Scaffold this active site. Structure first.
Site, PDB file in Angstrom:
ATOM      1  N   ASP A 338     112.743  51.902 -69.498  1.00  0.00           N
ATOM      2  CA  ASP A 338     112.736  53.071 -70.363  1.00  0.00           C
ATOM      3  C   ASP A 338     114.021  53.136 -71.179  1.00  0.00           C
ATOM      4  O   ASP A 338     115.091  52.729 -70.722  1.00  0.00           O
ATOM      5  CB  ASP A 338     112.580  54.352 -69.544  1.00  0.00           C
ATOM      6  N   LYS A 449     104.184  66.567 -76.323  1.00  0.00           N
ATOM      7  CA  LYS A 449     105.418  66.196 -77.015  1.00  0.00           C
ATOM      8  C   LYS A 449     105.974  67.322 -77.881  1.00  0.00           C
ATOM      9  O   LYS A 449     106.753  67.066 -78.803  1.00  0.00           O
ATOM     10  CB  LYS A 449     105.224  64.933 -77.864  1.00  0.00           C
ATOM     11  N   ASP A 679     112.446  56.922 -64.108  1.00  0.00           N
ATOM     12  CA  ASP A 679     113.229  57.988 -63.496  1.00  0.00           C
ATOM     13  C   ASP A 679     112.500  59.320 -63.432  1.00  0.00           C
ATOM     14  O   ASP A 679     112.622  60.033 -62.434  1.00  0.00           O
ATOM     15  CB  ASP A 679     114.554  58.168 -64.254  1.00  0.00           C
ATOM     16  N   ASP A 683     106.800  58.546 -64.653  1.00  0.00           N
ATOM     17  CA  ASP A 683     106.811  57.159 -64.207  1.00  0.00           C
ATOM     18  C   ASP A 683     106.348  57.014 -62.764  1.00  0.00           C
ATOM     19  O   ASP A 683     106.426  55.914 -62.207  1.00  0.00           O
ATOM     20  CB  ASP A 683     108.209  56.557 -64.363  1.00  0.00           C
TER      21      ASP A 683
HETATM   22  N1  LIG Z   1     112.866  69.779 -74.815  1.00  0.00           N
HETATM   23  C1  LIG Z   1     112.020  69.230 -75.719  1.00  0.00           C
HETATM   24  N2  LIG Z   1     111.182  69.996 -76.450  1.00  0.00           N
HETATM   25  C2  LIG Z   1     110.336  69.463 -77.349  1.00  0.00           C
HETATM   26  N3  LIG Z   1     110.248  68.147 -77.600  1.00  0.00           N
HETATM   27  C3  LIG Z   1     111.033  67.264 -76.943  1.00  0.00           C
HETATM   28  C4  LIG Z   1     111.981  67.767 -75.939  1.00  0.00           C
HETATM   29  N4  LIG Z   1     112.621  66.694 -75.442  1.00  0.00           N
HETATM   30  C5  LIG Z   1     112.123  65.599 -76.069  1.00  0.00           C
HETATM   31  N5  LIG Z   1     111.172  65.940 -76.957  1.00  0.00           N
HETATM   32  C6  LIG Z   1     110.419  65.006 -77.826  1.00  0.00           C
HETATM   33  O1  LIG Z   1     109.193  64.631 -77.202  1.00  0.00           O
HETATM   34  C7  LIG Z   1     108.935  63.249 -77.435  1.00  0.00           C
HETATM   35  C8  LIG Z   1     108.289  62.631 -76.204  1.00  0.00           C
HETATM   36  O2  LIG Z   1     109.306  62.087 -75.370  1.00  0.00           O
HETATM   37  P1  LIG Z   1     109.081  61.951 -73.784  1.00  0.00           P
HETATM   38  O3  LIG Z   1     109.734  63.132 -73.111  1.00  0.00           O
HETATM   39  O4  LIG Z   1     107.635  61.627 -73.503  1.00  0.00           O
HETATM   40  O5  LIG Z   1     109.948  60.649 -73.426  1.00  0.00           O
HETATM   41  P2  LIG Z   1     111.546  60.755 -73.311  1.00  0.00           P
HETATM   42  O6  LIG Z   1     112.156  60.438 -74.620  1.00  0.00           O
HETATM   43  O7  LIG Z   1     111.942  62.259 -72.897  1.00  0.00           O
HETATM   44  C9  LIG Z   1     112.124  59.606 -72.034  1.00  0.00           C
HETATM   45  P3  LIG Z   1     112.244  57.915 -72.670  1.00  0.00           P
HETATM   46  O8  LIG Z   1     112.932  57.900 -73.978  1.00  0.00           O
HETATM   47  O9  LIG Z   1     113.075  57.018 -71.626  1.00  0.00           O
HETATM   48  O10 LIG Z   1     110.764  57.305 -72.821  1.00  0.00           O
HETATM   49  C10 LIG Z   1     110.267  62.600 -77.769  1.00  0.00           C
HETATM   50  O11 LIG Z   1     110.136  61.793 -78.939  1.00  0.00           O
HETATM   51  C11 LIG Z   1     111.225  63.739 -78.047  1.00  0.00           C
HETATM   52  O12 LIG Z   1     111.679  63.674 -79.400  1.00  0.00           O
END
Ligand SMILES: Nc1ncnc2c1ncn2[C@@H]1O[C@H](COP(=O)(O)OP(=O)(O)CP(=O)(O)O)[C@@H](O)[C@H]1O
Ligand SMILES: CCCCCCCC/C=C/CCCCCCCC(=O)OC[C@H](COP(=O)(O)OCC[N+](C)(C)C)OC(=O)CCCCCCC/C=C/CCCCCCCC
Ligand SMILES: CCCCCCCC/C=C/CCCCCCCC(=O)OC[C@H](COP(=O)(O)OCC[N+](C)(C)C)OC(=O)CCCCCCC/C=C/CCCCCCCC
Ligand SMILES: CCCCCCCC/C=C\CCCCCCCC(=O)OC[C@H](COP(=O)(O)OCC[N+](C)(C)C)OC(=O)CCCCCCC/C=C\CCCCCCCC
Ligand SMILES: CCCCCCCC/C=C\CCCCCCCC(=O)OC[C@H](COP(=O)(O)OCC[N+](C)(C)C)OC(=O)CCCCCCC/C=C\CCCCCCCC
Ligand SMILES: CCCCCCCC/C=C\CCCCCCCC(=O)OC[C@H](COP(=O)(O)OCC[N+](C)(C)C)OC(=O)CCCCCCC/C=C\CCCCCCCC
Ligand SMILES: CCCCCCCC/C=C\CCCCCCCC(=O)OC[C@H](COP(=O)(O)OCC[N+](C)(C)C)OC(=O)CCCCCCC/C=C\CCCCCCCC
Ligand SMILES: CCCCCCCC/C=C\CCCCCCCC(=O)O[C@H](COC(=O)CCCCCCC/C=C/CCCCCCCC)COP(=O)(O)OCC[N+](C)(C)C
Ligand SMILES: CCCCCCCCCCCCCCCCCC(=O)OC[C@H](COP(=O)([O-])OCC[N+](C)(C)C)OC(=O)CCCCCCCCCCCCCCCCC
Ligand SMILES: CCCCCCCCCCCCCCCCCC(=O)OC[C@H](COP(=O)([O-])OCC[N+](C)(C)C)OC(=O)CCCCCCCCCCCCCCCCC
Ligand SMILES: CC(C)CCC[C@@H](C)[C@H]1CC[C@H]2[C@@H]3CC=C4C[C@@H](O)CC[C@]4(C)[C@H]3CC[C@]12C
Ligand SMILES: CC(C)CCC[C@@H](C)[C@H]1CC[C@H]2[C@@H]3CC=C4C[C@@H](O)CC[C@]4(C)[C@H]3CC[C@]12C
Ligand code: NA
Ligand code: NA
Lengths: 985, 34, 264
Positions: A338, A449, A679, A683
């Site tokens: 990740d 998302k 993490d 996952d």
């Molecule tokens: N607190 C929040 N509220 C709304 N959207 C968020 C958020 N935190 C992240 N996102 C957005 O949601 C999208 C989905 O990301 P997701 O949470 O599925 O993977 P992640 O980026 O948190 C872990 P990784 O990068 O290791 O895969 C991301 O592109 C991010 O921009």
């Protein structure tokens, strides 16, 4: 016994426990209850005492066979003493030796296992189980021990439930009760009382379970053994019958070698009975053959390897649940990692803001204020309002004293960064959330998302319904129909969307996470002041919002990640990045860490370079691909396999928790061993599906750590390479030990076959057969488990489980056809030298077996005319036996020295292994002591060797070394040739 | 004048035991090297 | 094992019989040929160091042990019947074969030596003194073809094992005493044991051509009154201090024991 508070109302809960439903008990009350009710820990059950495991070591493996042999030797001695006069003590001194060997090996194995178990246990208490509890109205993260009865706690996705708690306010909360119910299907939780049965209700959690998604405030009702799990006597940590591939290979080899040895022993017993042996001698001969043809001490080598690996993993801060699972880690051929939390430091600082069709450089700068950009127009105020209302992250209790950047926040990385930035520019987020009533909040999840909230407008022109939303810019812009520029709502045309895409390319291309924001003022005609919002119902206008802007925050890749990625890709391991972020950000990060190298271009990159459309470009021209998550939904099983096998550098962007499982199963279908680094709670199934699952010791949730086979206690990605190297080293050392052990079987069975065939006197006897095996094959074979790693241990391709096995057709061929044959030739040469220097020339020995072994023909004639008594020529025969044993020692010196390494020179390997030199010195010292000790002739029929009778095996000991050196030189000079095809084991 | 039918087996085994002691001592010293 | 030895497809009989099996067989043939050549050369070098006339070490055979002739079927137990010529035919044939070189016509070339003196030789001629068969009176086939058998008085030859370069001290003598309460009479025929010193030392099979060692013939006399019975006789070297006959581990060193059983 089934009594609970599931059916009890909320009104009595405050009265019964004396704690506020919202604020909860104070610190003083918590301390009083902790000092009264004790800690929240189940009593550790003593499974087995020390004497249980010691006896298991004593009576485990071939040690039971050696016990049987010693018992039969004692029985044979007893029968011989009862029957005859002047009995031989060979059987007594053999049974004593066998029992002593078993006891010593069992004690050594017990000591090594005690060390390994202590080291492994020292890590179970290392990780503190953290629980979030609201005390005095503020949420704090404490240890699971300090959780007491009465307080309210927050349980979210991936958080292990601390104790038996009664849910009082849950949103989106689903729990996994596979421990109790047995099914893995999540069950929803609601405060309302539904089912009469205490177990079947939906308003209480029964401890030792976890929440897959959603959040819940709940009052803890039970603590310790008083919970449901503590009532039942079933073991909570029930180990499953999982057999590692290395253990399966070892068991199969043990079975095959035991069958072969038993067949040989029975055949030799029958043949000796045909040759007019005696029963008390034939049974001892069979025991000697069986014991010498099985690899006793193989399990001690495995135990030493496991203990050494446990010692090495403890210095790298790598918790391993099963030490035999490191072989799979070394056999890993694919690594799915990740981006956020594994390849990045997970420290996010807001860097840029795109709004008013303009990019603004934002720097924190607690002092001296911003660099060049200022408050600007009302669009920035609207964006700050959006960020403040949408965030659910708050600072920890008693932390509003230090600078905001240094302050700690109990929320996600993006939420924490946004909170710090909006408290740097604006202020008092607590008062901001007090101003706007957060009636409705939709929890963030990777499936949607986006994060959404509904607030009441306190302005003069108040519609009383403000919808705030944040999330992925391409998903966010898909529904925000309008755009806010210069404070005036404007339609969103093609030009503004193109400008937004250019801004995303510019900000994202540097390797920064970008969040888009929208706010909408809901009409009052459609929604009055009193409206019943429901998640199931559409209610609020989920679509047709007004866009505001983008906030882009940096996240530098971890310092040790690039070198670990380089080592993995040089060792033959394909590194795939599976992330939920945009393809631009994921690709930039992959290029930064080295997953996508320089000189490899994507299909879109080639099209842009050639100024041609994305189509008409042959996909095979690109070895690196960045597959979007939404495109993976429509892909086929065959189509995915083309992606996973034609592209060296693969990135998966905008994926989902299920798509990670799809990628893992596809990679496992394509004959690869997959190590997944996850993490979060998204996952959990991928870690279980992967061959070796790796969690994170800090950023990882409490379900990823429970599902993974390995835990990185410092989140360092540079520990996976160490684990792979140690996994390779374990296999190398085990196969070296097996190869060394198997060489001595031919020298211990060829003398009897030649005896029968050529009718020569017996070259080797049972006592010397057991002296060759117990002296040269146990300590030197255990000493090969301490061997260091090769020079190019991490420069070889991962082993194919089918092509390369622990014991193959090339290890058996080598051991039984080259080294064993040379050793047997050396022993036979020494035997011939001894017999010829006394009078019996080699050609006189052909056919002497019948007369030599006759107790009454005391006139056997020399080649020189002399005549020997039976008791006179048996002295020479037993001297020949002693010399055979001593020459096997000499020829097994340069067999241990050449099994010390597999493809490199011994000079390059060095002499760091002190155990190997100790084993050589002790085996030769034992040989000299057995030969020259007074009283060995009467007891063990061992007679002194003359000084010149030690060098007979020297030409054959040098032959082994020279042959191995030349063949390994040929292997290195011509890789993939005939020699490496047939000889390289 | 040498005599056959006789070998200095006492000195032979004495020196063999001395060599065994030297090997044992050296193997112990190498193992526990400081 | 499905498709264990199937011929079709590229994989036939596990490894490719056309190429893989041929190559591995050639490799092992060359490997074992080199190993055999090395072993043969090492054995040749070892055999070059040795001498062809006297063994390198004679410290494992320091003293002689007696042995009786002929060798019976079962462990030095002579069983025969007076009225059954097929019972003792093997003993007679063995004794005739052994005593053929001792006949007067066979040992006419051997020189005659004075008695009582050790016959030490230095030159390469290495003559051998003759042992007349007439010494073994009534226990030779010249008088009667049966060596005392068929009359109840069997003859057994007791001979000392040969050691190269052994010089016995004093006057060696083999005395046989019947352990059967001396009911029969054991008659060692060359007077006493009387092993003359002129037959020592022995200089080897190559140097000492035509060597005939001293013999001692015992004749247990089974009286007609007691037909059958079993007689245990023990013969040991008694007159020489050089020839040890008191070792307990070796029951044949310097001594021998046997049993004679008659019938009818
Ligand atoms: N607190 C929040 N509220 C709304 N959207 C968020 C958020 N935190 C992240 N996102 C957005 O949601 C999208 C989905 O990301 P997701 O949470 O599925 O993977 P992640 O980026 O948190 C872990 P990784 O990068 O290791 O895969 C991301 O592109 C991010 O921009
Ligand atoms: C990398 C290469 C791999 C391939 C290797 C191929 C093989 C060739 C390698 C050889 C190196 C090792 C040599 C080992 C020699 C044998 C050791 C041994 O076991 O021999 C025992 C015999 C016993 O004879 P005896 O005493 O009964 O005869 C006395 C009687 N008389 C008076 C009658 C004549 O002895 C002898 O034959 C020899 C006489 C000397 C014995 C004493 C010396 C040995 C002691 C050494 C320890 C010294 C300390 C070393 C510390 C540093 C180590 C690096
Ligand atoms: C491990 C499984 C196999 C085990 C093998 C066991 C060992 C082999 C057993 C052999 C038994 C018979 C050995 C004796 C044969 C006759 C020896 C002989 O008559 O010696 C004479 C010659 C020349 O002597 P000279 O005239 O110089 O002496 C004159 C000097 N004066 C006068 C001082 C004496 O000596 C010579 O030529 C050299 C002697 C020749 C010896 C041949 C040995 C062949 C062995 C081959 C094994 C190789 C691997 C086999 C693999 C098997 C599985 C496929
Ligand atoms: O305390 C026994 C010691 C324990 O080592 P450690 O854990 O401190 O190593 C630490 C390794 N580092 C230094 C790399 C961390 O082990 C050693 O050092 C030496 C290990 C020697 C391995 C064999 C020991 C005996 C086991 C089986 C032999 C049974 C009898 C064999 C036949 C004898 C004649 C009849
Ligand atoms: C893993 C380890 C595997 C084994 C490693 C090698 C162990 C070998 C040890 C041998 C040490 C020998 C020490 C040198 C001799 C001095 C001594 O210490 O003598 C050893 C005593 C016998 O001495 P003795 O008084 O019978 O004299 C004998 C009379 N002579 C000398 C005329 C024959 O044998 C004894 O104690 C044996 C006591 C130790 C047994 C082990
Ligand atoms: C322990 C050391 C004892 C030293 C000793 O003084 O020995 C006393 C007795 C016999 O001594 P003696 O004076 O009657 O000599 C008789 C031999 N003569 C007359 C040729 C000198 O020796 C014995 O019975 C015991 C022989 C040594 C103890 C058995 C060791 C078995 C261990 C095997 C492990 C290695 C294989 C794996
Ligand atoms: C100076 C030169 C020194 C050479 C010594 C080498 C000894 C080290 C071990 C050698 C192992 C076998 C060497 C070898 O490469 O052998 C191959 C040959 C025939 O295979 P190829 O090259 O036609 O296959 C080619 C297949 N393609 C075209 C697909 C690549 O096998 C054969 O002729 C028989 C090979 C016999 C190997 C043992 C030679 C004597 C060694 C004794 C030490 C004990
Ligand atoms: C480089 C790779 C390519 C080449 C490889 C092949 C060449 C090297 C191999 C062998 C040559 C060296 C061995 C010569 C020994 C001559 C001994 C002799 O000739 O003894 C002959 C007689 O034997 C025998 O009775 C015993 C026969 C059995 C034992 C010897 C067996 C020899 C066979 C060895 C083959 C082993 C093969 C192993 C690998 C299999 C795959 C190839 C001559 O005795 P005599 O009549 O003088 O005795 C007179 C006796 N009396 C004086 C009492 C009258
Ligand atoms: C003498 C006794 C020899 C006994 C050897 C048995 C070896 C183990 C067999 C086995 O189960 O292998 C499984 C194997 C399969 O491999 P495997 O994966 O089961 O092996 C286990 C591997 N570890 C230990 C790592 C888990 O079967 C094979 O395909 C190989 C068989 C041997 C190939 C060599 C050719 C010779 C054929 C041997 C059988 C026929 C012999 C004919 C000649 C007989 C002459 C007397
Ligand atoms: C002479 C005495 C011979 C004593 C038996 C020899 C073999 C003993 C070890 C048994 C095999 C151990 C094991 O797990 O092997 C797995 C391995 C399996 O590993 P593998 O998978 O490399 O083997 C199959 C490989 N393919 C599929 C490519 C063909 O089995 C063997 O290698 C068996 C080797 C048998 C050798 C043939 C013996 C023929 C006759 C010899 C003389 C009789
Ligand atoms: C002469 C007697 C006493 C012992 C001789 C044993 C020899 C002939 C045996 C023992 C071990 C055997 C080898 C063991 C394993 C294999 C691997 C296989 O893929 C080809 C045959 C091969 C290479 C065998 C050839 C024959 C062999 C070398
Ligand atoms: C291939 C090369 C290395 C072979 C050359 C080495 C040969 C010739 C050497 C190495 C070992 C040596 C033997 C070692 C020990 C003995 C015992 C001794 O009482 C007589 C000599 C004898 C029998 C040696 C003869 C020569 C010998 C066989
Ligand atoms: Na073994
Ligand atoms: Na062995």
């Amino acid at each position: 016994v089934s009594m609970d508070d599931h059916k009890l109302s909320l009104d009595e809960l405050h009265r019964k426990y004396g704690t506020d439903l919202s604020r909860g008990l104070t610190s003083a009350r918590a301390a009083e209850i902790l000092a009264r009710d004790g800690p929240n820990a189940l009593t550790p059950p003593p499974t087995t005492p020390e004497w249980i495991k010691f006896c298991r070591q004593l009576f485990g493996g071939f040690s039971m066979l050696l016990w049987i042999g010693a018992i039969l030797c004692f029985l044979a001695y007893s029968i011989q003493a009862a029957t005859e006069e002047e009995p031989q003590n060979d059987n007594l001194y053999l049974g004593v030796v066998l029992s002593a060997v078993v006891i010593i090996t069992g004690c050594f194995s017990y000591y090594q296992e005690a060390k390994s178990s202590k080291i492994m246990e020292s890590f179970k208490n290392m990780v503190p189980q953290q629980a979030l509890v609201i005390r005095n109205g503020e949420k704090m993260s404490i240890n699971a021990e300090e959780v007491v009865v009465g307080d309210l706690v927050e349980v979210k996705g991936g958080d292990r439930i601390p104790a038996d708690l009664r849910i009082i306010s849950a949103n989106g909360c689903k729990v996994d009760n596979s421990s109790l119910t047995g099914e893995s299907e999540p069950q929803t939780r609601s405060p309302d009382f539904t089912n009469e049965n205490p177990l079947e209700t939906r308003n209480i959690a029964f401890f030792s379970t976890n929440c897959v998604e959603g959040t819940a405030r709940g009052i803890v009702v039970y603590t310790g053994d008083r919970t449901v799990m503590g009532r039942i006597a079933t073991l909570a940590s029930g180990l499953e019958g999982g057999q590692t591939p290395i253990a399966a290979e070892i068991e199969h080899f043990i079975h095959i070698i035991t069958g072969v040895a038993v067949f040989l022993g029975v055949s030799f017993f029958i043949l000796s009975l045909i040759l007019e042996y005696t029963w008390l001698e034939a049974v001892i001969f069979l025991i000697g053959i069986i014991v010498a043809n099985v690899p006793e001490g193989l399990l001690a080598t495995v135990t030493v390897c496991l203990t050494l690996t446990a010692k090495r993993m403890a210095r790298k801060n790598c918790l391993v649940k099963n030490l035999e699972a490191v072989e799979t880690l070394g056999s890993t051929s694919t690594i799915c990692s990740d981006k956020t939390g594994t390849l990045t430091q997970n420290r996010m600082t807001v860097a840029h803001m795109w709004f008013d069709n303009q990019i603004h450089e934002a720097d924190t700068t607690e002092n001296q204020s911003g660099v060049s950009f200022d408050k600007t127009s009302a669009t920035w105020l609207a964006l700050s309002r959006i960020a403040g209302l949408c965030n659910r992250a708050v600072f920890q209790a008693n932390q509003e004293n230090l600078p905001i950047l240094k302050r700690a926040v109990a929320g996600d990385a993006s939420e924490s960064a946004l909170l710090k930035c909006i408290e740097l520019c604006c202020g008092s987020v607590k008062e901001m959330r007090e101003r706007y009533a957060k009636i409705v909040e939709i929890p963030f999840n990777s499936t949607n998302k986006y994060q959404l909230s509904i607030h009441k407008n306190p302005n003069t022109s108040e519609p009383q319904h403000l919808l705030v939303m944040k999330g992925a810019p391409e998903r966010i812009l898909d529904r925000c129909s309008s755009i806010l520029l210069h404070g005036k709502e404007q339609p969103l045309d093609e030009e503004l969307k193109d400008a937004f895409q250019n801004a995303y390319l510019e900000l994202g291309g540097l390797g920064e996470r970008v969040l888009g924001f929208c706010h909408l003022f809901l009409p009052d005609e459609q929604f009055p002041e009193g409206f019943q919002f429901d998640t199931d119902d559409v209610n609020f206008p989920i679509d047709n919002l007004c866009f505001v802007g983008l906030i882009s925050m940096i996240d530098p890749p971890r310092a040790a990640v690039p070198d670990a990625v380089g080592k993995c890709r040089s060792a033959g391991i394909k590194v795939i990045m599976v992330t939920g972020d945009h393809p631009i950000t994921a690709k930039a990060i992959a290029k930064g860490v080295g997953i996508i190298s320089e000189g490899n271009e994507t299909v879109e990159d080639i099209a842009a370079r050639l100024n041609i459309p994305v189509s008409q470009v042959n996909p095979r021209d690109a070895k690196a691909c960045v597959v979007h998550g939404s495109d993976l939904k429509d892909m086929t099983s065959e189509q995915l396999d083309d992606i996973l096998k034609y592209h060296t550098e693969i990135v998966f962007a905008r994926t989902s928790p299920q798509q990670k499982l799809i990628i893992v199963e596809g990679c496992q279908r394509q004959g690869a061993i997959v190590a997944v680094t996850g993490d979060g709670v998204n996952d959990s199934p991928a870690l279980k599906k992967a061959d070796i699952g790796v969690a994170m010791g800090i950023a990882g949730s409490d379900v990823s750590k429970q599902a993974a086979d390995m835990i990185l206690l410092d989140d360092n990605f540079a520990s996976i390479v160490t684990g792979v190297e140690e996994g390779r080293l374990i296999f190398d050392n085990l196969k070296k030990s097996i190869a060394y052990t198997l060489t001595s079987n031919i020298p211990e069975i060829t003398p009897f076959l030649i005896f029968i065939i050529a009718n020569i006197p017996l070259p080797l006897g049972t006592v010397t057969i057991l002296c060759i095996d117990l002296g040269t094959d146990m300590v030197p074979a255990i000493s090969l488990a301490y061997e260091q790693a090769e020079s190019d241990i991490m420069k070889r391709q991962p082993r194919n489980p089918k092509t390369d096995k622990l014991v193959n057709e090339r290890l058996i061929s080598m051991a039984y056809g080259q080294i064993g044959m040379i050793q047997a030739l050396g022993g036979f040469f020494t035997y011939f030298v001894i017999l010829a220097e006394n009078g019996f020339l080699p050609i006189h020995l052909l056919g002497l077996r019948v007369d030599w072994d006759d107790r009454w023909i005391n006139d056997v004639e020399d080649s020189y005319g002399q005549q020997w008594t039976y008791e006179q020529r048996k002295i020479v025969e037993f001297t020949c036996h002693t010399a055979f044993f001593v020459s096997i020692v000499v020829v097994q010196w340069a067999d241990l020295v050449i099994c010390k390494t597999r493809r490199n020179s011994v000079f390059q390997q060095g002499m760091k292994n002190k155990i190997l030199i100790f084993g050589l010195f002790e085996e030769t010292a034992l040989a000299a002591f057995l030969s020259y000790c007074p009283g060995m002739g009467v007891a063990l029929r061992m007679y002194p060797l003359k000084p010149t009778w030690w060098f007979c095996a020297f030409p054959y000991s040098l032959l082994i070394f020279v042959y191995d050196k030349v063949r390994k030189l040929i292997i290195r000079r011509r890789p993939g040739g005939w020699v490496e095809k047939e000889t390289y084991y | 004048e040498d005599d056959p039918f006789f070998y200095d087996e006492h000195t032979l085994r004495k020196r063999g035991l001395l060599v065994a002691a030297v090997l044992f001592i050296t193997g112990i010293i190498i193992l526990t090297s400081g | 094992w499905k498709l264990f030895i199937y011929n079709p497809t590229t994989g036939e009989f596990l490894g490719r019989t056309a190429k893989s099996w041929g190559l591995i067989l050639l490799f092992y043939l060359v490997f074992y040929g080199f190993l055999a050549a090395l072993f043969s050369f090492t054995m040749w070098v070892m055999l070059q160091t040795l001498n062809d006339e006297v063994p390198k070490y004679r410290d494992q055979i320091p003293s002689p042990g007696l042995m009786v002739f002929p060798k019976p079927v079962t462990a030095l137990e002579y069983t025969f019947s007076r009225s059954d010529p097929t019972s003792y035919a093997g003993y007679i044939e063995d004794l005739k074969k052994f005593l053929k070189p001792y006949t007067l016509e066979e040992q006419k070339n051997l020189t005659v030596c004075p008695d009582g003196a050790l016959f030490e030789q230095k030159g390469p001629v290495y003559v051998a003194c003759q042992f007349p068969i007439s010494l073994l009176q009534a226990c030779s086939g010249m008088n009667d073809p049966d060596f005392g058998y068929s009359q109840g008085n069997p003859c057994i030859l007791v001979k000392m094992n040969r050691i190269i370069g052994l010089k016995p001290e004093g006057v060696p003598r083999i005395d046989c005493v019947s352990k059967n309460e001396d009911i029969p009479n054991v008659a060692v025929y060359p007077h006493n044991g009387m092993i003359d010193l002129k037959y020592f030392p022995y200089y080897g099979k190559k140097l000492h051509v035509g060597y005939l060692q001293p013999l001692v013939a015992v004749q247990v006399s089974f009286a007609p009154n007691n037909t059958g019975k079993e007689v245990t006789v023990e013969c040991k070297i008694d007159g020489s201090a050089n020839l040890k006959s008191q070792d307990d581990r070796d029951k044949f060193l310097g001594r021998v024991m046997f049993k004679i059983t008659a019938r009818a």
